[PDB]
Design an enzyme around this catalytic site. Structure first.
Site, PDB file in Angstrom:
ATOM      1  N   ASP A  22     -11.689   3.165  17.991  1.00  0.00           N
ATOM      2  CA  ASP A  22     -10.961   2.239  18.850  1.00  0.00           C
ATOM      3  C   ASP A  22     -11.757   2.058  20.141  1.00  0.00           C
ATOM      4  OD1 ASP A  22      -9.091   0.729  20.260  1.00  0.00           O
ATOM      5  OD2 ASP A  22      -7.715   2.384  20.610  1.00  0.00           O
ATOM      6  N   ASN A  24     -10.550  -0.323  22.662  1.00  0.00           N
ATOM      7  CA  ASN A  24      -9.705  -0.930  23.684  1.00  0.00           C
ATOM      8  C   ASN A  24      -8.404  -0.166  23.942  1.00  0.00           C
ATOM      9  OD1 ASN A  24      -8.454  -1.695  21.296  1.00  0.00           O
ATOM     10  ND2 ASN A  24      -7.796  -3.679  22.110  1.00  0.00           N
ATOM     11  N   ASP A  30     -11.395  -0.772  15.695  1.00  0.00           N
ATOM     12  CA  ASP A  30     -11.774  -2.173  15.651  1.00  0.00           C
ATOM     13  C   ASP A  30     -13.236  -2.359  15.291  1.00  0.00           C
ATOM     14  OD1 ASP A  30     -12.998  -1.705  18.504  1.00  0.00           O
ATOM     15  OD2 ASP A  30     -10.853  -1.341  18.743  1.00  0.00           O
ATOM     16  N   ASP A 200      -9.763  -5.160  -5.052  1.00  0.00           N
ATOM     17  CA  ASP A 200      -8.457  -4.501  -5.044  1.00  0.00           C
ATOM     18  C   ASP A 200      -7.636  -4.705  -6.328  1.00  0.00           C
ATOM     19  OD1 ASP A 200      -6.675  -3.081  -3.165  1.00  0.00           O
ATOM     20  OD2 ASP A 200      -5.307  -4.753  -3.635  1.00  0.00           O
ATOM     21  N   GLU A 254     -11.896  -2.148  -8.517  1.00  0.00           N
ATOM     22  CA  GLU A 254     -10.952  -1.029  -8.515  1.00  0.00           C
ATOM     23  C   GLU A 254     -10.070  -1.157  -9.740  1.00  0.00           C
ATOM     24  OE1 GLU A 254      -7.341  -1.088  -6.491  1.00  0.00           O
ATOM     25  OE2 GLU A 254      -7.305   1.054  -6.003  1.00  0.00           O
TER      26      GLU A 254
HETATM   27  O1  LIG Z   1      -2.231   0.151  -7.337  1.00  0.00           O
HETATM   28  C1  LIG Z   1      -3.058   0.781  -6.688  1.00  0.00           C
HETATM   29  C2  LIG Z   1      -4.290   0.118  -6.080  1.00  0.00           C
HETATM   30  O2  LIG Z   1      -4.436   0.257  -4.691  1.00  0.00           O
HETATM   31  C3  LIG Z   1      -4.910  -0.811  -3.894  1.00  0.00           C
HETATM   32  O3  LIG Z   1      -3.950  -1.828  -3.788  1.00  0.00           O
HETATM   33  C4  LIG Z   1      -2.809  -1.563  -2.825  1.00  0.00           C
HETATM   34  C5  LIG Z   1      -2.090  -2.834  -2.497  1.00  0.00           C
HETATM   35  O4  LIG Z   1      -2.887  -3.925  -2.221  1.00  0.00           O
HETATM   36  C6  LIG Z   1      -3.192  -0.849  -1.546  1.00  0.00           C
HETATM   37  O5  LIG Z   1      -2.005  -0.299  -1.000  1.00  0.00           O
HETATM   38  C7  LIG Z   1      -4.233   0.155  -1.706  1.00  0.00           C
HETATM   39  O6  LIG Z   1      -4.659   0.826  -0.405  1.00  0.00           O
HETATM   40  C8  LIG Z   1      -5.400  -0.406  -2.497  1.00  0.00           C
HETATM   41  O7  LIG Z   1      -6.574   0.384  -2.518  1.00  0.00           O
HETATM   42  C9  LIG Z   1      -2.793   2.239  -6.474  1.00  0.00           C
HETATM   43  O8  LIG Z   1      -3.862   2.787  -5.780  1.00  0.00           O
HETATM   44  C10 LIG Z   1      -1.462   2.318  -5.739  1.00  0.00           C
HETATM   45  O9  LIG Z   1      -1.521   1.546  -4.612  1.00  0.00           O
HETATM   46  C11 LIG Z   1      -1.048   3.688  -5.339  1.00  0.00           C
HETATM   47  O10 LIG Z   1      -1.832   4.088  -4.283  1.00  0.00           O
HETATM   48  C12 LIG Z   1      -1.215   4.673  -6.449  1.00  0.00           C
HETATM   49  O11 LIG Z   1      -0.329   5.732  -6.515  1.00  0.00           O
HETATM   50 CA   LIG Z   2      -8.572  -1.200  19.112  1.00  0.00          CA
END
Ligand SMILES: O=C(CO[C@H]1O[C@H](CO)[C@@H](O)[C@H](O)[C@H]1O)[C@@H](O)[C@H](O)[C@H](O)CO
Ligand SMILES: [Ca+2]
Length: 557
Positions: A22, A24, A30, A200, A254
């Site tokens: 951080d 600020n 940030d 994601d 992922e």
């Molecule tokens: O479905 C997911 C994918 O996570 C991704 O998708 C999620 C939503 O976009 C987000 O919350 C995560 O930080 C991201 O990396 C799992 O990791 C689930 O969120 C949980 O943690 C499992 O027990």
């Molecule tokens: Ca900040």
């Protein structure tokens, strides 16, 4: 022959910018904070950084609920700050991987505000809207963050789908106009120079036609069921063909929830889908089906999972490797021994593992220092939306007590990974001059960058040295991999081979002395590095004596 792509030999570091630096005093990290620290990351030996979401967001899920895909999150800074980060990374010859979150958007995205206005809005099928059934939800779909995965909207009387937060409506990939909009958004960032994209929950894009109810079996493991959309790979191939074919960015999926044997469909280079996988067989190898309880495992299970995962890559696929991230407990606490007398030794041994695995390694921020889980005392100590979901789903329903939930989520909660990076021993470990959005771990007095950077024997210094060795040793990135004894539950031992050169990695996972006998006909040639060792073996050694939590990398003859 051909050389290996840069990403197969690179070492990545994951930055969770909210909790890195951080500048600020508002308590949230940030861009300017991250840019100030590139010299630090460069010094460690880091080739590339993956940042968690940095787009405009209501922050109900810390960046993963995106309200505008082409503006920078106001907390992290401005677009100019983002460009500056990009420029400063390039000066150091570093590369940026951004997070791409297109399974769902925020409910404050202009698309969804339009979508929900009427059944006849041009954006209605950008999302999933359905009629309830039997006075209920359209079906029995559960949400990752608690309750039903269907939220009714009084504006129209219909329900919208949300695998995650209620404020994270799922995007409707079945609609070609939506896909084209997503493809354009991707170019927007790619045109800016972005070197990589992590996708994601990439496997949940395609929905099951008709949305029939999950079976009771499926309800037990719903996460896997949501990865079984019939058009998934058709959509990923289309995205590659319309976008990534025209760039030289690396793509990292992922793949949460998918059965391991479907992973090659995502990463086989011939299929022209994704370049690399993040799998979760390993990191959830001791997680119960409810995703908050723990199940006891041994090193045998740990190594056997790794072996399975590695074999899934095959000849044309490629894996990432990681022991930690923003969704999981701290690596040393989870896989090592975070007790004060074993923390440093075990954290070095896991480092040795992380950086000698076949794949592209990702080091999560803080693990290079040996940061640990945080000592949560009450349920009010968790910011995480997922814990609130467990309380809704298991406490409010009487399935478990709040004490039982607390005992268990303390060890599994994502928030363990989200406490501020521990830079020094100034107020709040130097993360902020104000009040941190999530409390800093009290162990910052012992565990902080400033104390480790000067000390040749520190956890940082050991990671730095391993990153050097790997960089200089091709077999340790792109070499073959072989587990010497998948049944051994005390000592992890394996080889990496390339072009007639073989290296042996040996890691005691026990807090007791152990011995290791090399395979018949194999002998130590050199010792590249060890942790917790009082003396290296002798040239010619045909076996090893190991201290508690000793690790080492050896070239053999
Ligand atoms: O479905 C997911 C994918 O996570 C991704 O998708 C999620 C939503 O976009 C987000 O919350 C995560 O930080 C991201 O990396 C799992 O990791 C689930 O969120 C949980 O943690 C499992 O027990
Ligand atoms: Ca900040």
């Amino acid at each position: 022959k051909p050389g290996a792509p840069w990403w197969k030999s690179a070492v990545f570091y994951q930055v969770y910018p909210r909790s890195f630096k951080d500048t600020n005093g508002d308590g949230i990290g940030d861009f300017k904070g991250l840019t100030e620290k590139l010299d630090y990351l460069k010094g460690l030996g880091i080739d590339a950084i993956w940042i968690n979401p940095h787009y405009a967001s209501p922050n109900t899920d810390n960046g993963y609920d995106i309200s505008d895909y082409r503006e920078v999150m106001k907390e992290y800074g401005t677009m100019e700050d983002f460009d500056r980060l990009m420029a400063e990374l390039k000066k150091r010859g570093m590369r940026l991987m951004v997070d791409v979150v297109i399974n769902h958007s925020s409910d404050q995205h202009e698309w969804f505000k339009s979508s929900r206005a009427s059944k006849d809005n041009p954006y209605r099928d950008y999302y999933f809207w359905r009629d309830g059934k039997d006075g209920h939800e359209p079906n029995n779909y559960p949400s990752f963050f608690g309750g039903s995965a269907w939220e009714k909207d009084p504006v129209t009387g219909q329900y919208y789908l949300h695998y995650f937060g209620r404020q994270q409506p799922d995007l409707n990939w079945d609609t070609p106009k939506l896909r084209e909009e997503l493809y354009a958004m991707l170019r927007f960032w790619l045109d800016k120079g972005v070197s990589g994209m992590r996708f994601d929950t990439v496997a949940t894009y395609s929905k099951t036609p008709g949305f029939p109810d999950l079976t009771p079996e499926q309800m037990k493991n719903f996460a896997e069921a949501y990865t079984q959309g019939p058009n998934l790979h058709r959509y990923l191939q289309e995205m590659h063909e319309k976008v990534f074919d025209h760039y030289d960015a690396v793509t990292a999926g992922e793949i949460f929830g998918a059965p391991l044997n479907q992973v090659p469909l995502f990463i086989d280079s011939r299929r022209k889908e994704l370049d690399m996988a993040f799998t979760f067989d390993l990191i959830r190898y001791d997680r119960a089906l409810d995703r908050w309880h723990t199940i006891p495992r041994t090193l045998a299970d740990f190594r056997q999972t790794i072996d399975k995962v590695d074999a899934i890559a095959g000849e044309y696929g490629w894996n990432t490797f990681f022991l930690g991230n923003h969704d999981n407990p701290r690596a040393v606490s989870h896989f090592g021994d975070d007790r004060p007398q074993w923390r440093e030794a075990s954290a070095k041994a896991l480092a040795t593992v992380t950086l000698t695995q076949r794949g592209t390694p990702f080091i999560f921020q803080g693990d290079e220092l040996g940061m640990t889980n945080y000592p949560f005392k009450t349920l009010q100590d968790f910011d995480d939306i997922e814990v609130k979901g467990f309380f809704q789903d298991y406490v409010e329903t009487g399935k478990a007590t709040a004490e039982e939930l607390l005992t268990n989520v303390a060890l599994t909660s994502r928030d363990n990974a989200r406490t501020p990076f521990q830079w020094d021993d100034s107020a709040n470990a130097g993360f902020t001059t104000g009040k941190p959005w999530l409390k800093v771990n009290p162990n910052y007095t012992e565990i902080n960058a400033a104390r480790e950077i000067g000390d040749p024997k520190s956890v940082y210094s050991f990671y730095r040295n391993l990153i050097s060795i790997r960089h200089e040793t091709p077999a340790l990135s792109t070499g073959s991999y072989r587990d010497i004894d998948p049944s051994n539950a005390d000592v992890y031992a394996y080889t990496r081979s390339q072009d007639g050169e073989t290296y042996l990695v040996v890691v005691n996972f026990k807090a007791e002395p152990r011995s290791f006998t090399l395979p018949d006909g194999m002998h130590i040639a050199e010792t590249l590095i060890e942790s917790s060792s009082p003396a290296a073996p002798a040239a010619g050694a045909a076996s090893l004596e190991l201290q508690p939590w000793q690790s080492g990398i050896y070239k053999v003859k």
